[PDB]
Design a protein around this ligand. Structure first.
Ligand SMILES: [K+]
Ligand SMILES: [K+]
Ligand SMILES: [K+]
Ligand SMILES: [Mg+2]
Ligand SMILES: [Mg+2]
Ligand SMILES: [Mg+2]
Ligand SMILES: [Mg+2]
Length: 76
RNA sequence: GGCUCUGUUUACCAGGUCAGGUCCGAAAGGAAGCAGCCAAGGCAGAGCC
């Protein structure tokens, strides 16, 4: 069950992306990391400000996560 | 009802500490602040008033 914890560990095998991507996840709660679909507008705003990013950066991380979760489902 | 103890629970919506990330600064230095943790609140059991 590929989640943001798994993704975060993949980001830990950029700081031009990797450190910033890790930071966004580091502003999340464990429920958010476990079930990223619950992250809607208000949680995105909290995560963005808490990581010094914009909401569009959070959107981009979530999209990258989503693409990886789709690919892991299919490779498996 | 109050207080205490114990268990549990709680993204943000004036608490503390604030990793990471962020901001200001040439630096020296500063600042805001999410997660966690802590406090506190919620739900209960027990004890006391
Ligand atoms: K308690
Ligand atoms: K905090
Ligand atoms: K920090
Ligand atoms: Mg809080
Ligand atoms: Mg605070
Ligand atoms: Mg720091
Ligand atoms: Mg600078």
């Amino acid at each position: 069950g590929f989640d943001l914890n798994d993704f975060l560990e993949q980001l830990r095998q950029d700081d031009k992306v990797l450190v910033r991507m890790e930071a966004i996840i580091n502003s999340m709660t464990m429920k958010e990391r476990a079930k990223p679909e619950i992250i809607k507008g208000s949680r995105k705003r909290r995560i963005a400000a808490g990581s010094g990013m914009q909401v569009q950066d959070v959107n981009r991380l979530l999209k990258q996560f989503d693409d990886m979760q789709r690919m892991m489902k299919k490779m498996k």
